[PDB]
Specification:
721 residues, alpha+beta, Chondroitinase Ac, Chain A, domain 3, 3 domains, twelve-stranded antiparallel beta sheet, 31% helix, signal, carbohydrate binding
Length: 721
């Protein structure tokens, strides 16, 4: 019968299938459909149409392998989508309808029911299979009796009776938290409706609400926008993804129920979008430092992953109403339009999503202006993201500490991310493809950009750990100026070094001191390992004289600066050394296959050319000091190098500081509570991080103690002279 429940199921259908939105007029939709058509075809031709069939399909015959149960039901779902798409050749095809109805019965009888026990992977019996069944039944609720629907969904309540636990039928049930909670909604909320059971519906939602909180310790979203999962790993870009992407999928339904979700919880979602996600998106790209082991998945590079997030943000905008709706539509649209490298539509798997995007993209009533500058200090996850709207570039600083793991290596994924958190920095510029197109399987992992390491070999079997020090953090003065530090010690404890970064509106200063080494291995810092474009070659200038780099390596003593020039200034990169340094450089072809960094990935050889710039550290107590200036031409780069003449205030074992005369801003890092005098203007008294701007005779002070994670009174840390 047609009631309020079916109303919710039609919305659900609208979100999963959306045959109502169909339009054979964009390769995207016609493709997806053209694909299912084929799939339903070979599925109907390969099915076992016998009276004593021992299974339904030979490719997924052995039902002791749970993956086979899930796959089987998924073909039925694919049949369910087409049989209800007016444009499909199988639209209302009695053979298909009969096939599903009969396939469901057979399965219910001989393979998946309340009588069986989990054999193989619980995930299949509890999430994978139940989903396919809900969507198949929801989609074809017009070809199924209510009585039948209860019958085929009884097994779901068997393996998944409680909206707070998974594996309640195994000898190790666990509490559903964060991400899996969305699956819980996908499995119970839906069957709740299918069964017209208000309690299951209300219970599940009440439980889904667990995730609508902000936290101050452990897994979850933080007030500064950080997001932690798997105990202490920064994960906004993957597990954070599935939370806003999957949840945006359920919300529309939840709200039109008798159990809407509190408005104070919705406003939190909003806080996540503006505080957690937005800042991690640069030029259609989701910054890798937040994606964890996902960087090693060939099918999930930066721009591709950015789409999971945006399509989620869009779902929220679509269901929001006031300004909120509009300001989010602008966010999605300006960001989508800023990505000239990746076709957003290649990663929109549902007709509704594709539809929503094509409408947004062509609505003029939705302003679409390039985003303004911003600087996020995700101190709760040791990462900083900077974006200068003026010159068009992004900056990612990837750290870790006693509160966070340096890198995740599990399930044979990200086998070589040893140093992607040992001070790694990301520069997002004119080349939107830099961190894609085989970057990960071909980049030299022993030389991650910005890190300080020894040439000791690392094992593919290693796993990450936390840092000994709690002294890692960032002080944000404004949206353009900030300072960060990391009391670094290497993975095997044979090297320490004070690493500091000074983000100053249109450039960042890199400082390292107290470099010590107790191993026999040689130590050096990677100034950069940049992935080059064959189309856009670079011309290199060392001390403003052109140089011809080698595959091998040339040493450049008394180096004052290095300039990587492009025919496009948005891709230009310059390096200024406050003190002439001895660096080495090279340019060579690096080959690697995704399998080397991820077992389940392709062994197909990949290759890219890279420009590597390094500085060796031969004696104890060494240091490095350079300013990275992106997006300006050689003449402007050479002028600015004349301006930052005395920008280096100090770089020693207790104090590191850079001064921007142009802005009247100081970036200071103190490792002790000694009295330090800066520019003969003031003194700073306490161990910590400062970012200071002189406003007339005043001084705006941003102070932060990374160990206690709190600020302090100006009197306590600063003194005018």
């Amino acid at each position: 019968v047609k009631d309020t429940y079916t109303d919710r199921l039609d919305d659900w259908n609208g979100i999963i299938a959306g045959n109502q939105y169909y339009d054979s007029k964009n390769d995207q939709m016609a493709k997806l459909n053209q694909e299912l058509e084929g799939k339903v075809a070979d599925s109907l031709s390969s099915i076992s149409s016998q009276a004593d069939r021992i299974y339904l399909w030979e490719k997924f015959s052995n039902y002791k392998t749970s993956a086979n149960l899930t796959a089987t039901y998924r073909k039925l779902e694919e049949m369910a989508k087409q049989v209800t798409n007016p444009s499909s050749r199988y639209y209302q095809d009695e053979t298909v309808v009969r096939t599903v109805r009969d396939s469901m019965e057979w399965m219910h009888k001989h393979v998946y029911n309340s009588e069986k026990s989990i054999v193989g992977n619980w995930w299949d019996y509890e999430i994978g299979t139940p989903r396919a069944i809900n969507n198949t039944l929801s989609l074809m609720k017009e070809y199924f009796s209510d009585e039948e629907i209860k019958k085929y969904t009884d097994v779901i309540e068997k393996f998944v009776p409680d909206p707070e636990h998974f594996r309640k039928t195994t000898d190790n049930p666990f509490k559903a938290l964060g991400g899996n909670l969305v699956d819980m909604g996908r499995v119970k909320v839906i069957a709740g409706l299918l069964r017209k059971d208000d309690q299951e519906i209300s219970s599940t939602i009440r439980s889904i609400e667990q995730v609508f909180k902000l936290v101050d310790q452990g897994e979850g979203f933080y007030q500064d926008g950080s997001y932690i999962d798997h105990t202490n790993v920064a994960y906004t870009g993957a597990y954070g993804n599935v939370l806003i992407d999957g949840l945006s999928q359920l919300l529309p339904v939840i709200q039109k129920t008798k159990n809407p979700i509190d408005k104070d919880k919705m406003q939190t979602m909003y806080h996540w979008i503006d505080k957690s996600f937005a800042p991690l998106l640069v030029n259609g790209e989701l910054m890798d430092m937040s994606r964890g082991r996902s960087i090693s998945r060939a099918n999930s590079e930066g721009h591709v992953a950015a789409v999971e997030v945006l399509r989620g943000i869009h779902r929220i905008a679509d269901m929001s109403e006031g300004e909120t709706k509009q300001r989010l539509q602008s966010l999605v649209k300006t960001i989508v339009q800023s990505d000239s490298y990746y076709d957003v539509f290649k990663n929109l798997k549902t007709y509704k999503d594709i539809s929503l995007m094509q409408s947004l993209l062509s609505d003029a009533g939705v302003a679409s202006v390039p985003r303004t500058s911003y600087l996020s200090a995700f101190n709760k996850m040791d990462k900083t993201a900077m974006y200068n709207a003026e010159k068009g570039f992004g900056f990612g600083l990837s750290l870790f500490s006693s509160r966070t793991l340096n890198y995740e290596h599990m399930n044979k994924e990200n086998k070589r991310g040893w140093y992607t958190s040992d001070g790694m920095f990301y520069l997002y510029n004119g080349d939107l493809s830099h961190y894609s197109d085989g970057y990960w399987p071909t980049v030299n992992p022993y030389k991650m950009p910005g890190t300080t390491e020894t040439d000791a070999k690392r094992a593919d079997s290693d796993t990450g750990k936390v840092l000994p020090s709690a002294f890692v953090g960032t002080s944000k003065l404004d949206d353009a100026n900030a300072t960060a530090t990391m009391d670094f010690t290497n993975w095997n404890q044979t090297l320490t070094a004070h690493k500091s970064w000074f983000m100053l509106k249109d450039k960042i200063a890199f400082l390292g001191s107290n470099i010590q080494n107790t191993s026999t291995d040689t130590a050096a810092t990677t100034i950069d390992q940049r992935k080059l474009e064959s189309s856009n070659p670079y011309k290199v200038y060392v001390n403003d004289k052109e140089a011809s780099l080698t595959e091998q390596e040339k040493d450049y003593p008394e180096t004052q600066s290095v300039f990587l020039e492009s025919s496009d200034s948005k891709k230009n990169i310059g390096y200024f050394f406050f003190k002439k340094s001895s660096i080495s450089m090279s340019k060579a072809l690096q080959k690697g296959a995704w399998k080397d960094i991820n077992e389940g990935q392709s062994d197909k050889e990949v290759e890219n050319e890279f420009l590597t710039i390094s500085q060796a550290h031969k004696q104890n107590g060494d240091s490095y000091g350079y300013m990275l200036i992106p997006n300006v031409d050689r003449a402007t780069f050479n002028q600015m190098i004349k301006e930052l003449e005395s920008s280096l205030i100090e770089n020693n074992e207790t104090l590191q500081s850079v001064y921007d005369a142009k802005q009247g801003v100081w970036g200071i890092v103190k490792y002790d509570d000694s009295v330090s005098t800066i520019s003969n203007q003031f003194q700073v008294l306490k161990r910590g991080v400062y970012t200071i701007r002189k406003e007339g005779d005043e001084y705006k002070i941003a102070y932060y103690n990374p160990e206690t994670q709190e600020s302090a009174p100006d009197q306590e840390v600063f003194k005018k002279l």
